[PDB]
Structures are given as C-alpha cells and as structure tokens.
Amino acid sequence: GGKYRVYIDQYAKQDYFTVGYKGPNEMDAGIYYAPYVALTPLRGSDPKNFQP
Amino acid sequence: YKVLEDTPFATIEESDLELALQIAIVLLKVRLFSDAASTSKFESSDSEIADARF
Amino acid sequence: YVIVGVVENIGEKEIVGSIFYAPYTEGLDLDDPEHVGAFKVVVDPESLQPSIG
C-alpha cells in the first residue's frame, strides 16, 4: 500500500506474518543487531601432516 | 615385500633365507612392495610421513 | 639380474615403454615445473622450529 515494507521469510516453518515497527532513529527498533567483528579469516596448517 | 602366491617359499628348497627370497622374487611368488601410496594415506590427518634425515 | 626392455617416443602421443612414470603437476603452482611436486612449510606451534616436507 506504499506503507509497509514486506519481506519473505524463505524458511518460514508454517505460514504466518509478523507486523513490526521501525523508526527512523537507530535507537527506535525493539531489537538491535550490533556487529563488532565480522568475518575475520584464519589461516594455518598442521605440522604433523602439512594439511592446511 | 608382498605375497603374490599362498605359501611363498612352498617350492623353494634354498636354506639361506636371503637367497630364498631372491628366488621368490624371480619366480613371482613374492613381489617387491615398494610403491606410491593411495592418496588417502596422507589425507586422514591420522597420518605418518616418512622422515628424511642427514 | 639383467633386464632388457623398451623406451620409445615416436611423437606427440605415440609413447611406448615398460612403465610410464607419468607425474601429475597440473593445478600445482610451481616455480620451474620441471621440478615435479612441491614443498610445504608449517613451523611448529609449540617448539617454534621450522618444518618442511
């Protein structure tokens, strides 16, 4: 309707909808995902067999 | 060495075990086992790599 | 003992002989591919001595 942003839960378990609110301000949202560190790679190998 | 035929040395009268073995190679009772490993041998992580020394 | 046998190379594909060895290096990034095979280095995480194979 030009009003609600609709998203599809591609893995929905049954059949449902959830209506939620999100304000323009970052503090106005109910739940806050606040990343600190992301996708930092690690590298190495095992000296007994040289497999990476 | 690896055995090709059951009871290697069954027909080798040679008493000197070293020579009896040379005979087993010649007569195809036993084959030298030296060979490359199936690739999985070193992929299990439960692996042993022959040392090189000096 | 004594063994006699054949090694012949006519060209392109017509390669004949008793045992072909035929090493596999494709996909392995080599400095002078004529070398065949490659080195790997780890270095122990406890003792800090190097390790190579």
UniProtKB/Swiss-Prot annotation, chain A:
TM region positions: none
Domain of life: Viruses
PTM characteristics: A proteolytic cleavage by the prohead core protein protease gives rise to the mature major capsid protein during virus maturation.
Function: Major capsid protein that self-associates to form hexamers, building most of the capsid in association with pentons made of the capsid vertex protein and one dodecamer of the portal protein. The major capsid protein self-associates to form 160 hexamers, building most of the T=13 laevo capsid. Folding of major capsid protein requires the assistance of two chaperones, the host chaperone groL acting with the phage encoded gp23-specific chaperone, gp31. The capsid also contains two nonessential outer capsid proteins, Hoc and Soc, which decorate the capsid surface.
Subunit structure: Homohexamer. Interacts with the portal protein. Interacts with the capsid vertex protein that forms pentamers. Interacts with hoc; one hoc molecule associates with each capsid hexamer. Interacts with soc; this interaction reinforces the capsid structure. A total of 960 subunits of the major capsid protein forms the 160 hexamers.
UniProt record similarity statement: Belongs to the Tevenvirinae major capsid protein family.
Designated name of the protein: Major capsid protein
Naturally occurring in which organism (per UniProt): Enterobacteria phage T4
Organism lineage: Viruses, Duplodnaviria, Heunggongvirae, Uroviricota, Caudoviricetes
Part of the full-length chain shown: 418 to 469 of 521
Curated annotation (Swiss-Prot), chain B:
Quaternary data: Homopentamer. Interacts with the portal protein. Interacts with the major capsid protein that forms 160 hexamers.
PTM info: Proteolytic cleavage at the N-terminus by the prohead core protein protease gives rise to the mature capsid vertex protein.
Family note: Belongs to the Tevenvirinae capsid vertex family.
Function: Capsid protein that self-associates to form pentons, building the capsid in association with hexamers of the major capsid protein and one dodecamer of the portal protein. The capsid vertex protein self-associates to form 11 pentons, building the T=13 laevo capsid in association with 160 hexamers of the major capsid protein.
Residues spanning the membrane: none
Domain of life from the UniProt record: Viruses
Name the record gives this protein: Capsid vertex protein
Organism of origin: Enterobacteria phage T4
Range covered out of full length: 108 to 161 of 427
UniProtKB/Swiss-Prot annotation, chain C:
Top-level taxon: Viruses
Post-translational modification: Proteolytic cleavage at the N-terminus by the prohead core protein protease gives rise to the mature capsid vertex protein.
Function: Capsid protein that self-associates to form pentons, building the capsid in association with hexamers of the major capsid protein and one dodecamer of the portal protein. The capsid vertex protein self-associates to form 11 pentons, building the T=13 laevo capsid in association with 160 hexamers of the major capsid protein.
Family from the record: Belongs to the Tevenvirinae capsid vertex family.
Subunit structure: Homopentamer. Interacts with the portal protein. Interacts with the major capsid protein that forms 160 hexamers.
Name this protein carries in UniProt: Capsid vertex protein
Species annotation: Enterobacteria phage T4
Gene: 24
Residues of the full protein shown: 322 to 374 of 427
